[PDB]
Amino acid sequence: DITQSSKAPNPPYSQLFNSNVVQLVQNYAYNTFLGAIPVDAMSQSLMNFVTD
């Protein structure tokens, strides 16, 4: 209802609701997925999913 500026969003918002919250939540998600997979574990070279 453009004719009324009173109920218009003041202040206007364009950012996310909480970028930091989803940021941290996705951080622990990635960490838990990468570390949660079991791995053959005796020596350092052998848990390496990736090379150098």
């Binding site: 053959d40 052998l46 390496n48």
Partner: protein
């Protein structure tokens, strides 16, 4: 990686994967192929021209 040198050994994490995958495929017990003597006489019996 330099494992114990007696028969098959993995020299890398990739070789560790290969030796696992062949181990699961149970290629270390290849099937019992025919006896030379037995199969050979059944050969002589079957491959020959009949009534000659």
């Amino acid at each position: 990686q330099s494992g114990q040198d007696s028969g098959l050994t993995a020299k890398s994490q990739a070789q560790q994967a290969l030796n696992f995958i062949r181990y699961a495929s149970a290629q270390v017990t290849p099937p019992s192929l025919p006896k030379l003597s037995a199969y050979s006489e059944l050969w002589n019996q079957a491959t020959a021209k009949p009534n000659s």
